[PDB]
């Protein structure tokens, strides 16, 4: 009927059409933050605890006294590699849970557990 191929069934029937519809459905504007299970992790693996906490500004005091009590400490984030010392911390990154507290004069270390080249022979 045709020349070579016009619209055969067995050829490219493996696409993924998931263009669903969504645009805000349960957005809440309560003043106090809702209790959410946040996961906090120390620099490499010294301390790892994840509990539900609800705090706006005082929430920062937790990351500090949680491991060590200090009056002034630099808050850094290995997620992107940036240093912060004000409430802008969680506001400088997308919604996520990351916490690190150390003294100044310290850079980020190499931390990756994906598929480096450590394995290849067998």
Say how far apart CA 75 and CA 60 lie, in whole Å.
9
Could you give the residue ranges of the DSSP H alpha helices within the chain?
59-67, 88-92
**DSSP per-residue letters across 68-84:** S--SS-EEEETTTTEEE
Tokens of 69: 């009590």
CB of 74 within 8 A of CB of 85? yes
| Alpha carbons 87 and 21: distance in angstroms, whole number | 34
Class of the CATH domain delimited by 1-122: alpha beta
């Amino acid at each position: 009927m045709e020349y070579l191929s016009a619209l055969n069934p067995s050829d490219l029937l493996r696409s993924v059409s998931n263009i669903s519809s969504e645009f805000g459905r349960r957005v809440w504007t309560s003043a106090p933050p809702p209790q959410r299970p946040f996961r906090v992790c120390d620099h490499k693996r010294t301390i790892r605890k994840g509990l539900t906490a609800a705090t706006r500004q005082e929430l920062l005091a937790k990351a500090l006294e949680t491991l060590l009590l200090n009056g002034v400490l630099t808050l850094v984030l290995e997620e992107d590699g940036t240093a912060v010392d004000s409430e802008d911390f969680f506001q400088l990154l997308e919604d996520d849970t990351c916490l690190m507290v150390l003294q100044s004069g310290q850079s980020w270390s190499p931390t990756r557990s994906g598929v480096l080249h450590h394995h290849h022979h067998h």
